[PDB]
Amino acid sequence: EEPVYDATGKPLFGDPSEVHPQSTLKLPHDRGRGNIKTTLKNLPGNHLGPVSGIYVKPGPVFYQDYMGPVYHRAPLEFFSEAQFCEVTKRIGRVTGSDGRLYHIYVCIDGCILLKLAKRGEPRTLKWIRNFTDCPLWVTSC
């Protein structure tokens, strides 16, 4: 099971793992003045308040700051292969729970998708299950 982490950077269970050096999440980094929601077009303070980066969970729900536990790596246990989406918006580069670098997208239908950053696995993965209701910290400001 992939850990979630508190705002202090400590995992709530299990062991910590490093994020990929080329992820758009750079740690350590503070966060959590509030749970401040945003939208894809308002993706990053700004007019909505404090910004610590980009966070996303299935829904889709986006935040620009978040106080509760978050994933530092995409929990691949909760992703499944899905179909190629022709209309996507790339939002960052995330570490998978497998330690590899993925590009992360939001599809025009609202689905959160990953593609492996390195060539060789052309498939699209989709975040199917919002099991813990914790967002993924995609990028830090």
Numbering used by the authors: 21 to 64, 72 to 168
Text from the published report:
Pestiviruses, such as bovine viral diarrhea virus (BVDV) and classical swine fever virus (CSFV) use a virally encoded protein, the N-terminal protease (Npro), to suppress the transcriptional activation of the IFN-α/β genes by interacting with IRF3 and inducing its ubiquitination and proteasome-dependent degradation. The Npro protein is a leader cysteine autoprotease that cleaves itself from the nascent polyprotein during translation of the viral mRNA, freeing itself for innate immune suppression activities. Npro has a unique ‘clam shell’-like protease fold that is distinct from other known proteins including all known proteases. As predicted, Npro consists of two domains, a cysteine protease domain and a zinc-binding domain.
Here, we report the crystal structures of CSFV Npro and a C168A cleavage site Npro mutant to 1.6 Å resolution. The first 19 amino acids are not essential for proteolytic activity of Npro and can be deleted without affecting the in vitro protease activity. The structures presented here show that the C-terminal β-strand (one half of the product peptide) remains buried in the active site pocket, indicating that once cleaved, the C-terminus of Npro acts as an intramolecular inhibitor and thus prevents trans-activity, i.e, the enzyme is inactive toward additional substrates. Additionally, the short α-helix containing the catalytic Cys69 is disordered in the wild-type Npro structure, which may be an additional measure to deactivate the protease function after initial cleavage. In comparison, CSFV Npro structures do not have a disulfide bond between Cys69 and Cys168 because the active site-containing helix is disordered in the wild-type Npro and Cys168 is replaced in the C168A Npro. Thus, the CSFV Npro structure supports the classical cysteine protease mechanism rather than the catalytic mechanism proposed for BVDV Npro.
